[PDB]
Design a protein around this nucleic acid. Sequence first.
RNA 1: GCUGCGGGAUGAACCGAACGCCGGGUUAAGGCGCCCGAUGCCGACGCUCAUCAGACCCCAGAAAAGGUGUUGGUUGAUAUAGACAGCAGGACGGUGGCCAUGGAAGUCGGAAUCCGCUAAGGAGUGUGUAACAACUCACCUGCCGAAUCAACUAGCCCUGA
Lengths: 139, 195, 175, 175
Amino acid sequence: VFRRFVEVGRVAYVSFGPHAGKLVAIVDVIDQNRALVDGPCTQVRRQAMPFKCMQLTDFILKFPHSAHQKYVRQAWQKADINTKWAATRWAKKIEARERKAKMTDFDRFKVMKAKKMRNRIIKNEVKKLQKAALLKASP
Amino acid sequence: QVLVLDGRGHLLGRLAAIVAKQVLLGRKVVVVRCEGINISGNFYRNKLKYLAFLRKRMNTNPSRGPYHFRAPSRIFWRTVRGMLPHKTKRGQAALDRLKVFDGIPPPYDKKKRMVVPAALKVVRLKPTRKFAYLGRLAHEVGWKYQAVTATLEEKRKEKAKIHYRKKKQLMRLRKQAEKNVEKKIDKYTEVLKTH
Amino acid sequence: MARKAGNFYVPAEPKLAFVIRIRGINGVSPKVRKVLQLLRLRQIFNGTFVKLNKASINMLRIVEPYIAWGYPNLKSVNELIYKRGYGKINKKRIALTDNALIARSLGKYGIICMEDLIHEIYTVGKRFKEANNFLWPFKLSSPRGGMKKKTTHFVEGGDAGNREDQINRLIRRMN
Amino acid sequence: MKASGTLREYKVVGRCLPTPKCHTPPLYRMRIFAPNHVVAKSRFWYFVSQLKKMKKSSGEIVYCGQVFEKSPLRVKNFGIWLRYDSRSGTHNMYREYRDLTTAGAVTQCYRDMGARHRARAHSIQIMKVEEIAASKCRRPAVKQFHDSKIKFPLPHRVLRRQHKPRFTTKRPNTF
RNA sequence: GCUGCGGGAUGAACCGAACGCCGGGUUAAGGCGCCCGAUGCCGACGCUCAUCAGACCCCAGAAAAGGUGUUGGUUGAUAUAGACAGCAGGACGGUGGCCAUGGAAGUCGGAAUCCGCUAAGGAGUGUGUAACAACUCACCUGCCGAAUCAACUAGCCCUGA
Ligand SMILES: [Mg+2]
Ligand SMILES: [Mg+2]
Ligand SMILES: [Mg+2]
Ligand SMILES: [Mg+2]
Ligand SMILES: [Mg+2]
Ligand SMILES: [Mg+2]
Ligand SMILES: [Mg+2]
Ligand SMILES: [Mg+2]
Ligand SMILES: [Mg+2]
Ligand SMILES: [Mg+2]
Ligand SMILES: [Mg+2]
C-alpha cells in the first residue's frame, strides 16, 4: 500500500491540460499542490504543474535537488526511459486508445468480420470444452 | 430505454438531481436498493430534520393535507416530487415514468444495475465527515420492514454468489479457449487494427 | 535615445480620446445629463471622438460614472470611420460610401477625402471641429465578451472610467 | 483594486511638475503590484498621495514598466508585509509564501488574505516584498516544506466529474 | 404617481432599462444541482462541523459578553550554564517576630520585608484542626529528553438566542 509517491526525480504522466500524453519529471514540490516539472526529451517545457493534473508512474531517476535541463537530460539518457516506457502494457493501452481514435470504416469492417469469425470459433470451442468437461465428469 | 440504478453508496440530493434531470428527457429510470442511499451529516441531525418534517402537519385535518411516508423508496420519490414540476402535465408524466423500489425486485435481480459516479459518497464527501443510512433512518422512524428486506437481500446475495462462480468458471473456460491455438491469424489483424 | 544615456523618457500625452457611453437614460442627474447632451451621447452605446483639453477633461471627470473614455489606436479610428462612417449634410445622416459626400459637404478646408478625414481625426489639426460635427455619433453594438459590472471605475475592475489603451480591446469587441 | 486573475509587478516612477518655485522634482520610485498598468498608475497615485505632498494634477508619471521575474524557474521564498484593515481596526502582518515568481507570491497573498481574514482588496496594502533565504523562515509550514529527499504520496485522489458517462457499472478505485 | 420589460420566488419606490409589429446576433441587472434557459470547466486558493449551520443592497430578525472548538497575526518570556509537563525528595534557623489576647505559632485582619544555611524555602499561594500541629504551592534537586509557556488580536463555528 502506497507503492507510489512524488519524489525528487520521478517521471510522471500528464492527463489533463495542454500537455496530455507527455511525460514530465518532478524536480521539487513548491507548496502541497504544484510541482516544478521538466521534460528532457518529451517536448514539455520546465514549468509548474499540479499534482491532480499529473498522473503518478513507477519509474524513478536520480536527480540532484533543483538540477538543470542538462543534468536532467543526461540522467534521462542514462536511465533510457523511452524504450523501457514503450516496452510496457501501459503504453500499449494508451496506443490502442489512440489507434481506436485513428480507426476508419474499412478498418472497422475488417475488425467486425474477424470478430464474427473469432466469436464463432470461441463459441464452438467453449461448447467442445464443456462437452469434454461433462464427459470427464460422467465417470 | 430503461435504466436500473444502484443505491449503494449514493447521496440523496445528488442522485435525486441526476434522476430528476434524466427522467424529463424520457429515459425510464428506476432506482433500486433505495435503503442503501447515504445522506451526509450526523444521523441525529438527519432524524431531527425528519422529526420536524413529521411535526409539519395540518391541525384542522391531518389526513386532508400533509402526507408523510416512512419507506425510503417513497422518501426518495417525495424528494423527486419536490424537484419536478408535478403540478403540471410534465412532472406528473415524469413521476409516472419514474419507478422506485426498496430491496431488489426479481426482474431487477437479473437486469444490470448502473452506478452513477457523480452521486457517489466517495466522490462527493470527505471520508472524515459523518453520514447516515436512509434505511437505518427509515427503520428507526416508521418503516418496520427491515427484517424482511434484509433477509431477502441476503438471499439474493447468496443467489449472486452461486451465479458468480458459474460465470467465472465460464470465463476461465473461454480464456482457456483463447489460450488454445488457431485464433491468432485474426488476432494479428486485430492487434494491427486496434485490439 | 534616452536609455543609451541612462535617462528616462515620457511620451506626449495625446490630445484625442474616444468616448463611449455605458450607462442608461432614466435616473440621470441634470449636471451630467447636460454634459452628455453636449457630448452628443443622448442614447446608450454611442461614441464620439473628443479633442482633449482642460475643459474637456474636466467634463469627463463630471461624467465619469456614465462613460468609458480612452486613447484610440490607428485601427480603432480606422475601423470606426470605415465600417460605421455616417456623416450629415444638414439633417439626414448618410453613410459615407463615396469621397464625393466629404468633398461636397466637408471639403471646404482641404479635407475632401476619407484619408484626409482619418488624418484629421487622428492627428488633431486646426479643423477638427468641422470633422467632429460632420461625423454623426457612432452607434455601437454591445460587446461580445460582455462588460465588467458597469458601475465602478476601470481601476476597481469596472467599466465607467479611464483605461487609456483597453478601449482598443473594447472597440474590437463592440465594433 | 479588483485583483482579477494573476497579479503583475510594475515599476512606476513619478515626480512633481516643473515649477519656478522648485525645478527638478526628485523623481520618486515605487514597486506597485496590480493586474494591469492602469491600476498600477492609479494605486501609485494613491500611495504617493498618502506618503508625500503629491496629487495627479500637480504631478506626472515619468515611466511605468513591467518587471519580469529574475528567475522564474526557481522555487523561492517570499516574505510579504501587510497593512490590511480589518472590521475593528487595521493591523500589521508578516506572511510567507513559497512560490516561483514575485507576482505569483503576491497573488497568493491577496487570495489568502481574502480567504482567511475576509479582507477585501480595498483594505490590503502591500508594505514590502522581500525574498528570504533558508533557515530564516518563521513559518512552520514553509519550514517543513524545507526538506531534501521529500516523500509524500497522493492519498484519495478523486477526479473527472462526469467526463466519464453519467451511467456506468464502474466504481472508481482511488489511488 | 402618469410606466410596460429583464433580475430581487412573491413588490410602487430596489438594480438594470424605459414600450410601434417582427427575423438574426450581442449584452446589462442577475444566474448556471432540479424545477428554471445556462459551468456536465478533469476551475484555482484557503476557512468551516452546526444535536437551532449558511446562502447576496433596501429584504423580512438580534446585541453586550464568553470558548484549552480550529486557522492566521502581534507583543514577549524560557531552553544544552538540559526548560516545559510527568514521577520522586526537600521546603529550615533567628522567630510562637512584630499591632492584637475571642486566636495567629507563615494561614480572619493593620504595617511591612532582612540575614544565615544555602540545593532552597517566599517573616509565606491555598486546604484546615476553633487555635497548637499535619497537607500543599512559589523555589530547589534526581530520571526523561527538545522545543515550551503567557497575554492580546481577528476570520469561520458554538453559547448567549
Ligand atoms: Mg437605475
Ligand atoms: Mg457568445
Ligand atoms: Mg446607480
Ligand atoms: Mg413622466
Ligand atoms: Mg420581475
Ligand atoms: Mg426576496
Ligand atoms: Mg432578439
Ligand atoms: Mg453579471
Ligand atoms: Mg438546465
Ligand atoms: Mg475565538
Ligand atoms: Mg448563531
